[PDB]
Amino acid sequence: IKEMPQPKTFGELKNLPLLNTDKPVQALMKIADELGEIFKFEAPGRVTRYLSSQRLIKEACDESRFDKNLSQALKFVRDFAGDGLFTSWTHEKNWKKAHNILLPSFSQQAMKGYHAMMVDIAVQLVQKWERLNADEHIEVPEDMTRLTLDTIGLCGFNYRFNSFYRDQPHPFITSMVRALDEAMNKLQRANPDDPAYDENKRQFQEDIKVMNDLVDKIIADRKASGEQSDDLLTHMLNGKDPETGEPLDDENIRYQIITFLIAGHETTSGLLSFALYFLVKNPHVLQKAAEEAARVLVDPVPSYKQVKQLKYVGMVLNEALRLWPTAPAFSLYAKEDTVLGGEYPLEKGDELMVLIPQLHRDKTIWGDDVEEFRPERFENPSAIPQHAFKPFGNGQRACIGQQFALHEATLVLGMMLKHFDFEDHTNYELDIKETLTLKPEGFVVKAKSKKIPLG
């Protein structure tokens, strides 16, 4: 057996102070560089092991040996996402029921139906950019977040956040962003029962209240209406689990819509923000992506068929997902006593953190140029070893939204490369802000129209 490495210690507090930082994933990536494919992490009441190699993670991805664990991050989000699919244990009845009912709604076939609604928000973004005055710049994450939140709103619940009509975000979103921020702040908050956080707790309960009232209202209205809008809310009110014959209740539907609205905010827009960033830093890659867009997107508004044809744009999103996965870690627990890589023995209940950005830089898999933006790496999926590329997590607890997120990102990116030339006018220096997700903070561009009509 190997004694696995541990990073620097702080007497009683062990390693806890290393997560007392505004960029913990990046801090943890630098520790991985030093310590390698596994290190232990202790804190007063807990212990976790961080994996970085395809070698160890491919075993952790064995669902017969490891199941999804709720991280302290997920337990904190659970306070408003409840037993939604994202913050439920594999063994909760509402996980499997909601999973069986919703999978058909998130299928690559179901994308045919969402396409029109997605095109409606993508067109809103293109027109915003066509209507900019000369020398006016684009705030990339902010406009990408407008598109992604509006798209999950419209396609899911037939609800228009109308993000391209406002400076200040919708009220639901104000409360959701503040709630997610409270949840992320609680991780490194020592003495959280101190009365200084009474305004945090009071505000937290209000933000929860806002989210529940607005979503429960959406759900009440829809049932009272009787309208059969082809969308997630409809599928969830009419759906029945093949296994147990039961439908989701109204409270659990709410949790799913809250989970979807979290997922489709900065988590999804992150992918577009990192993609456009990599594209403008790598002009020969942008040029090739734009040539595909122009060749494939011959109609004034793209069809579902043409999006499937944007293969190089698909490879660009995968390569952005390799370097900066916007849900950068997920937690597993050993279902039984077991041995990882023949070296490190684990007792039943032991937790693993998978460090996805570090997996994606494993040079044994990707070779020596792992820091380079080469979409060509993804030309053949059969040449890529098992469990090498995990931006969407693993097995039955993988991202149900993967097809939706990739379809919207392919459509939108395609339309952006067809309609505009891009300028990195500030020569932007990457600064990755860490919240519940990752985003290139302050990332700005200019977009010259090619003056191609949408009509």
Ligand X SMILES: CC(C)C1=CC2=CC[C@@H]3[C@](C)(CCC[C@@]3(C)C(=O)N[C@@H](Cc3c[nH]c4ccccc34)C(=O)O)[C@H]2CC1
Residues acting as catalytic residues = 267, 392, 399
Q: Which is nearer to ligand X, 48 or 148 (CB)?
A: 48
Stretch of 22-30, 161-169, 398-406, 420-428 lying at the interface with ligand X (CB under 6 A): 22-30
Q: Does 117 bind ligand X (CB under 6 A)?
A: no
* Binds ligand X (CB under 6 A): choice among 101, 214, 436, 445: 436
Q: Which is nearer to ligand X, 77 or 233 (CB)?
A: 77
Q: Does 19 bind ligand X (CB under 6 A)?
A: yes
Q: Does 48 bind ligand X (CB under 6 A)?
A: yes
Stretch of 3-11, 66-74, 245-253, 371-379 lying at the interface with ligand X (CB under 6 A): 66-74
Smallest distance, ligand X to C-beta of residue 454, A:
35
Smallest distance, ligand X to C-beta of residue 443, A:
20
Q: Which is nearer to ligand X, 23 or 281 (CB)?
A: 23
* Binds ligand X (CB under 6 A): choice among 28, 110, 354, 413: 28
Flag whether 397 is marked binding.
yes
Smallest distance, ligand X to C-beta of residue 436, A:
5
The interface with ligand X within residues 203-242 (CB under 6 A) comprises none
Q: Does 29 bind ligand X (CB under 6 A)?
A: no
Stretch of 56-64, 239-247, 322-330, 336-344 lying at the interface with ligand X (CB under 6 A): 322-330
Stretch of 17-25, 89-97, 150-158, 290-298 lying at the interface with ligand X (CB under 6 A): 17-25
* Binds ligand X (CB under 6 A): choice among 18, 74, 211, 214: 74
| Helix/strand/coil (H/E/C) assignment for every residue in the chain | CCCCCCCCCCHHHCCHHHHCCCCHHHHHHHHHHHHCCEEEEEECCEEEEEECCHHHHHHHCCCCCEEEECCHHHHHHHHHHCCCCCCCCCCCHHHHHHHHHHHHHCCCCHHHHHHHHHHHHHHHHHHHHHCCCCCCCEEHHHHHHHHHHHHHHHHHHCCCCCHHHCCCCCHHHHHHHHHHHHHHHHHHCCCCCCHHHHHHHHHHHHHHHHHHHHHHHHHHHHHHHCCCCCCHHHHHHHCCCCCCCCCCCHHHHHHHHHHHHHHHHHHHHHHHHHHHHHHHHCHHHHHHHHHHHHHHCCCCCCCHHHHHCCHHHHHHHHHHHHHCCCCCEEEEEECCCEEECCCEEECCCCEEEEEHHHHCCCHHHHCCCCCCCCHHHHCCHHHCCCCCCCCCCCHHHCCCCHHHHHHHHHHHHHHHHHHEEEECCCCCCCCEEECCCEEECCCEEEEEECCCCCC
The interface with ligand X within residues 121-150 (CB under 6 A) comprises none
Q: Does 73 bind ligand X (CB under 6 A)?
A: yes
Q: Does 359 bind ligand X (CB under 6 A)?
A: no
Binding-site positions for heme:
399
> Applying CB under 6 A, which residues contact ligand X?
19, 24-25, 28, 46, 48, 71-74, 77, 187, 327-329, 353, 436
Binding-site positions:
68, 95, 397, 399
